[PDB]
Chains A and B, each alone.
With several copies, the nearest count.
Chain A
């Protein structure tokens, strides 16, 4: 909620935050567990 706090504090209404750490963790998880990979795609 840090980005939400920043948006509530100092404007920034159009900067869409790309959390690349979450995406990389999700990709590693999908690679690690074939069940999640099967259900996701």
Chain B
């Protein structure tokens, strides 16, 4: 117990949290950035500290500052992170929560809802466990660390290693999806049409079936990921899909995949074969644009 709570009503917030509004009470003290705020909060004991996040580059230093504040100033404190425009993935929010933050306020919520959420946490004690070592938390944010096509062996091993990591959310590790191509096009051709963007996204070809593992992707937003890593119209390149998003289901499917004979595995087409696109689409950088092609109306 940090017995004395004399600043239980003091609100130490970044100046950006109040979007130009005057300080609501005499208890609000504003700071220019999240380094003067951290310095002042190293002396508080029960105050509410509201950080402001505007870039993804300042997530790791903010995580370290939150970790230091939580591991030194006890559980009576209230640490809030106010995302302003767009800076966070779900994994980054999980890292911030595991470092000691009580709540991360999304940028979608306007200022009034943000203030009500700030007042919602009053009188509450952070009862979760914050580990001493920050490197483990920082390593939890990306546990796959390999992007693109992988061999059936390497793909299965990487996905299984991710599913066997205990320092990861249960039933939130990712989505394993198997795509069956449209009858007009094959599976290596389908491989040529997929361009994963994030580090933890991998794929492989085997048994006339393209399987994808999107790291830290929820089931409800699988279509957004597929639309990002394929010519927007999914369904002009695949017929049906099978999705596994739970640890038991993913493990069972990986066990089934390991039984595939090595003669049915796939390899990428040689770069010489990458002359004629499979469909009418071009990948100009990090986006798919479909090129119209001539046809005859019937």
Contact = CB atoms under 8 A, between A and B. Distances in A.
B231 interface: yes
Nearest to B232: A32
A13 to B, nearest CB: 28
Interface residues of A, number: 3
A34 B289 CA distance: 10
Contacts of B289: 34
Nearest to A28: B231
Nearest to A34: B289
Contacts of B231: 28, 32
Contacts of A32: 231
A32 B231 CA distance: 10
A38 to B, nearest CB: 12
Contacts of A34: 289
Nearest to A29: B231
B288 to A, nearest CB: 13
Nearest to A32: B231
Nearest to B195: A24
A35 B54 CA distance: 31
Interface in B183-234: 231
A26 to B, nearest CB: 13
A27 B231 CA distance: 12
Interface string A4-41: 00000000000000000000000010001010000000
A28 B231 CA distance: 8
Interface in B221-264: 231
B283 to A, nearest CB: 14
A39 to B, nearest CB: 17
A14 to B, nearest CB: 30
Interface string B171-193: 00000000000000000000000
A32 B289 CA distance: 13
Nearest to A25: B231
B227 to A, nearest CB: 14
Nearest to B289: A34
B270 to A, nearest CB: 20
B46 to A, nearest CB: 48
Interface in B280-298: 289
Contacts of A28: 231
B257 to A, nearest CB: 31
A28 B192 CA distance: 13
B144 to A, nearest CB: 24
B66 to A, nearest CB: 35
A17 to B, nearest CB: 22
A15 B244 CA distance: 49
A34 B231 CA distance: 16
B237 to A, nearest CB: 14
Interface of B: 231, 289
3 contacts: A28-B231, A32-B231, A34-B289
**Ranked 3 nearest A-B pairs via Cβ:** A28-B231, A34-B289, A32-B231
